[PDB]
Symmetry: C4
Subunit: 446 residues, 4 copies
């Protein structure tokens, strides 16, 4: 018996009202200044529009809302009328109520047009849409906000141009007005010439060009220009502020990358490192930026540490499920195993593990070739290998001994890292470490 | 015997002085240029205003202040005169002292008007108010500062317009001035036409429109325009800077939210997660933003860790006071218990606790339904439940064993979390853990 | 059989195309408005340019690209045509296709010039270059982006000026146009005068000056100015946003330094420290800023903790290799030793180690003199020394006893710091600590 | 034999050169356009200025500099000539060399004035001063940078005005120039009228007003305005960027404070806390902001942890030196004791320690009254006290028992905090804890 605020009916009703509001807001100054009122072909359409909003006044009592403290619903139509009658009812029933149609049919005009300028309270619904669409996900945020600013700027042009043409009509002596002193016969021309002339006056003093045509002579008009140029100063400052937000935010990523590269280059050229350490640092920052892992670190560390477990369970479980070491290790162990795996990504020709380094982490390959050569003991050649899926670092499992070989990449790779302390934290989950240790003993003895 | 600076008398005295300062600052250029001086109907009011400030000069010796290093008072009127006589006394006694009323009554004028332009030192009190109202809590900060800028801009318009009308009066050959070459008979017109014309000239070169009327011909006036247009360049840059602060600060929250959603969507569409993990991540960020917990985390972690204990004592003590487990647990234990409770809030249909997960935390419900179904062992159906107040996670109290069921939400909930390490930290507070363990044994055996 | 996208041939082919695109984009409005078409001396060059792009349409099928998910190559020409035929093929084959040369040779003009305005789709390659050069390392980032903005601004001036000269030619009554009412005989003048006049009109309404010459009289031209002044408002806001990024980013370092100095001075002058502690704090921040160690800390702590080991191995191994203590300590121990050394840098006259201070760290000198004097026990003189390479702090190795002397610098120095906990972490690497302890015993006994 | 770069002689020599450079840069356009050259009264002064710079060319070989990698000196005049002859020698010896005085005395002019426009290379010294004064401590940073921008803007006005007056002189037909069509007789007027007119033209198109006087008619002049208005667009954007930095940086502190208060108020009014917890949170943030402890925390935690020990040794040693507990505790213990003391500051009426709270820290008063009342057991009244210097929290030294009383402030205080873990860390420093424990036993037994 109560209409939910997420039906397909009510949302299409709102968007039909939004098109109707845009119609009313475009007509109202153009009706206020140029055209007369006694003819009725637009009077019909205005009365129909007032009928639609009078229907909406009734129908907003049947609609549920979303409360702030308790969520997802408010029903039982008490407190709905308390919400609607306190916040938005008074100005809506002032705006919806016809006054010109009663003045026309009762006895009878300028004081009745000002009562028709209250139709602009209907323009809150456009603000409610541009509040919804920023916060909705499935839209470009830097498109909606510039659309909002273009809407406000175009409406300021329109309303100011029509009000100045009004104050040019109502004044005796057509000469010494802004349009009279240039065109001496202007009331006999069409609507398109007068409307384009008013619009052209208004935009040359909004966008602060100000050629020198169409300046003011009438002192009341000379008074209107003071308030309009104050308003244009304020709005132009606001517009430059929004475009500064769009430019600062659109290019933050590339600027932060170039900061990191400048800092690495100053640190390198200060201490005079030869070539190799420079190329390692700069290529490693280039491949941190091509796979943008900084936002990955932040947004993974903002997750509630169970959804990241389901992420790693999707990504790395069939890779860890088939290794040299793990054979029969009881997948209910693997669910608690997988969730601490921290992926990584590595440049080519970066010496990963050097000879006689004290061990720190397991390096399961997921892709990419690896080339191992003797370091210090062997001047050149020798042997060293590992292929997709084939782990290494299995010396420092429990042997606690340094790595035999050198580890230099050939083509780029993706290397998982279950480190030493993570392994020793996995040690207390016993009765399945026996299978791992049997795989170690039968692995190395063969 | 010494007036405190927080009485209701002295604050109303200051605000009466602020209205008097605004009066003096509006009159002084308008008196300096347009009107004469020999008539006395405003001379009376100016002498009365000088009387009020001469009273304030005496009365500021009886008032205490707030020192910088030691707080809350300085009394004993030594060092009050040392403060007042060193900082603000000289220019105040130069501004308050009448010079035109002595020139009028002594013997007698342009050199005496410049001595009346020193009345603008009285305008420090408006700066002191706009320093107080930013730092006071009970006002909108983005309203006060724009009011300050509108005040400075309007006063610049006013003073520049009146000074240019002065330099147009004092020059012989009324033609070849800015107002003379357009209106040849301008000294015979009223005050309102000349004042609106001067104001209209001034605003078309402050807001950089510059139509082309009212340009300068007199070379001294052509010299005045150089300094005024330098000043307008500086002030327009300052105004755009302040509106850039208001726009960058007004929309930081929505922009940060949309950053987080873009980063989550790039991380999802890079690694090709199917649907479910995308919808979990995006709905969890949407419900971190509807209940803005990031500012909560920051401002709770900036608190001195006793007021947050009183906060949690108000919020969660009658909820934890009535549980399945806790029955008679001696509320002086509960005061030390409650202060480490970390609240949270959760989306619907997010799988909270999965089957055979190694346990991490207690999950006391505070609201919201919970639905538990068999995971892996059971393909569908089965049973699992918990209602408002009914805790779960009571397996991993001391049993150290994985959870039996799956835990999927149905409608959204608020779930407290006293985690495993927090429980084991609460273990050393003994002689009341016996009641908890008896409640465990009689709880599970039934 | 497939051309790689990193050959020297294909890159020079692209840059030749970029010069050809700049040629076409400069000619096309200037051809559209001023000159005729029936003559053929430029028609030849345009057909040759269309030939070059028709060659490029074929040749872009033989070129490999870089995929997003898997890197470094895509070969095997399937999916290359799927990439090229879906993204960029349609508008390229619309732009490359000649239509004016077919209109000239088939039967025959304004509707055929608009088909020649589709040559501006060729201007995507300039956007691809200005996307590459920001992300490439070996270029100044704040030079490329301002070059991009100057390019867009100059092209807007050019195209708007030529389009307004077109709409001034095509209108009957040469008077009441923008160039007709000032120059009554303008079609008989040269190209340079008309082109400079159109360019001069366009820039006085792009850069919002607007003198007052050359305003519009024709109502269709009065309509064109509305769209052009809207566009200029948008572009001027965008340009101010980019220069705000350049100014905020160019002076962040000096502003952060001056923040730190202001905060230290307020903390000093609040609590009334006499002189010495002020000069120590301020000179220490000055020598943190002359050797900018903050970016060093950040970019070293962002490194993957093996490249920083190779850095410290290059920088400090021949310094630690020759000390009082270390003599025969088996350089495979030294590789694991060096990587935890944290360098530092110190002001002169800063008291480094005071008398009877509980010990914290080893202080190996690398440069700079050190002067030690008796503290408290000795009023003045006494003795204390250490020279380049000569360590101190060797009391608190295992003696766990306070330092004997005071340590005040004379000229500035660079002092390594292997602290107490780092030494005790190095203790478990035994069978070579015996040599260190023998060097201690024979060191102190002599 | 080598002049140090920090003598009082050489710095005064540099500042005399800076005044001479400002003289040359102001004269050179004004000499280039207005005045003739054959008279000699300024020719003398120009030759003298060239003599001063020819002396400086020699004298810059005797001066030491500061190297980048090794600091504080470079002597031994090899590599000084390598620095000076590579970087700055060529353009200095081109600028210093006279060419007009040789043209005047050799045989003989426009091509020789362009050789005199190379005197503007001498203007690097003003850039070196405005690089030094930002980085020097004893100057306001937001004053120097705005002075730099005003200098560049005024010089742009000056040079552009004089160059346009040149291009107005050199053209035949004095009518159809910018100054000719308004003043038909302008070459017969003085210097002040022509100079003010050129300056007034230049500033109305720098500050984008553009009245409508003084527009261009000569096509070469119409070409000059294009480059000058491009330059003014660029410079106006740069100026707005710098004022945006000054406004964003000048009001960051108050804006951050108001952020914290808004976040605390939203967190309070969301969860509906009654009054007391709101007033505690808001008054505690107000007294974190009146004594700005956030910058204190940052800049103390950036210190090298020995200077902060000397700070706490100056601030708190004679306060801790005289307590209830500590009597004879051997001040060489006190030097290691003091350095971990963390000061704090507290609002009035904030309940500091509640009844039956598990203890956390010692609370030595340094000022401010304290009032203790019974909590829960006692409804009202009771007793509780502590005065300046009199510690409390001495229950939980080793008794590990909750506090007896409640602790509510009356007037604001400053309370040191040596916490529980800091005390237990001080426990291993024995052979003087016996005196503390004797003071405990004789303290409580009395
Ligand atoms: C041709 C006819 C077209 C008709 C269709 C157009 C009708 C759309 C109408 C939408 C209206 C809602 C837009 C809104 O809500 O107003 C923004 C605020 O506007 C300002 O800047 C006002 C600064 C004033 C300048 C100071 C005055 C100086 C004294 C919110 O911006 P926010 O900060 O994002 O919330
Ligand atoms: C019609 C009559 C109305 C009379 C009533 C109005 C009188 C009110 C008067 C209030 C005055 C106090 C306002 C203040 O203190 O001046 C702000 C600073 O102003 C600037 O921008 C000055 C930039 C100059 C531009 C460079 C010059 C270029 C060479 C502080 O701003 P802050 O940074 O927030 O401290
Ligand atoms: C004399 C002849 C010279 C011819 C040579 C010049 C041709 C070069 C041509 C390069 C073009 C690529 C440059 C680009 O891509 O367009 C930037 C975007 O431009 C804007 O600002 C457009 C704002 C519109 C204002 C709103 C309109 C208001 C309704 C990207 O900027 P981004 O943000 O960095 O990506
Ligand atoms: C009346 C006679 C007075 C004579 C005395 C004055 C002589 C002083 C002369 C000082 C000069 C050094 C100042 C400097 O170095 O130039 C700043 C940079 O200037 C710009 O903005 C240039 C933007 C160009 C706009 C693009 C052009 C668009 C195509 C550095 O600013 P920075 O970023 O802080 O380094
Ligand atoms: C002189 C002339 C330029 C005046 C134009 C000013 C407009 C910018 C004014 C006229 C009516 C105003 C609207 C009417 C009230 C609206 C409801 C409010 O919840 C949001 C702002 C809201 C949408 C206003 C925005 C600003 C408007 C559109
Ligand atoms: C050419 C014309 C536009 C000059 C107007 C400049 C004004 C903006 C000047 C005139 C007098 C100045 C005021 C007088 C001194 C005031 C005391 C000081 O503690 C705060 C600034 C303070 C309030 C000044 C602000 C700027 C004012 C109001
Ligand atoms: C009224 C007149 C000023 C219009 C000029 C507008 C120009 C600024 C428009 C005209 C053609 C447009 C270009 C054509 C399409 C181009 C491909 C796109 O991938 C990047 C933008 C891209 C390069 C456009 C940038 C903006 C241009 C250059
Ligand atoms: C059209 C007219 C407005 C041209 C004026 C442009 C000035 C802004 C140019 C003219 C000469 C230029 C100066 C000459 C070279 C100087 C050395 C360099 O290390 C710093 C910039 C440096 C100081 C330049 C700054 C910009 C100046 C002062």
């Amino acid at each position: 018996h109560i209409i939910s605020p997420f039906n397909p009916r009510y949302r299409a009703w709102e968007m039909w009202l939004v098109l109707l509001v845009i119609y009313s807001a475009w007509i109202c100054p153009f009706q206020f200044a140029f055209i007369t009122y006694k003819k009725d072909a637009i009077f019909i359409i205005d009365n129909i529009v007032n009928g639609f909003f009078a229907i909406d006044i009734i129908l907003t009592f049947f609609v549920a809302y979303l409360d702030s403290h308790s969520y997802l619903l408010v029903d039982s139509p008490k407190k709905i009328a308390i919400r609607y009658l306190s916040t938005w009812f008074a100005f809506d029933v002032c705006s919806t109520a016809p006054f010109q149609p009663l003045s026309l049919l009762f006895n009878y005009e300028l004081g009745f047009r000002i009562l028709s300028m209250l139709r602009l309270w209907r323009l809150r619904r456009v603000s409610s849409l541009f509040a919804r669409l920023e916060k909705d996900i499935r839209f470009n945020y830097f498109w909606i906000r510039c659309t909002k600013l273009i809407s406000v700027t175009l409406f300021a042009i329109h309303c100011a141009g029509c009000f100045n043409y009004l104050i040019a009509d109502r004044y005796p002596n057509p000469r010494k007005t802004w349009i009279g002193a240039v065109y001496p016969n202007f009331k006999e021309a069409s609507l398109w010439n007068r409307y384009v002339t008013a619009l052209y006056w208004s935009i040359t003093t909004l966008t602060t060009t100000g050629y020198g045509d169409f300046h003011a002579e009438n002192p009341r008009e000379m008074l209107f220009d003071i308030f309009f140029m104050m308003f244009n100063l304020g709005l132009t400052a606001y517009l430059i502020g929004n475009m500064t937000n769009l430019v600062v935010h659109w290019t933050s990523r590339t600027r932060t990358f170039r900061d990191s590269v400048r800092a690495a280059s100053e640190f390198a050229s200060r201490n005079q490192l030869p070539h190799d350490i420079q190329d390692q640092m700069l290529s490693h920052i280039c491949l941190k930026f091509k796979t943008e892992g900084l936002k990955q670190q932040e947004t993974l560390n903002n997750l509630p540490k169970a959804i990241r477990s389901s992420i790693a369970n999707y990504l790395f479980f069939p890779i860890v499920h088939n290794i040299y070491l793990f054979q029969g290790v009881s997948r209910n162990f693997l669910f608690q195993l997988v969730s601490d795996i921290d992926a990584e990504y590595f440049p080519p020709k970066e010496d990963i593990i050097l000879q006689n380094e004290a061990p720190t982490d397991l390096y399961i390959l997921v892709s990419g070739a690896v080339d191992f050569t003797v370091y210090v003991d062997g001047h050149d050649q020798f042997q060293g290998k590992a292929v997709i899926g084939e782990t290494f670092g299995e010396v420092g499992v429990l042997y606690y001994r340094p790595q035999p070989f050198t580890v230099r990449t050939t083509e780029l790779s993706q290397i998982l890292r279950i480190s030493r302390t993570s392994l020793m934290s996995a040690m207390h989950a016993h009765a399945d470490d026996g299978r791992v240790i049997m795989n170690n003993l039968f692995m190395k003895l063969r």
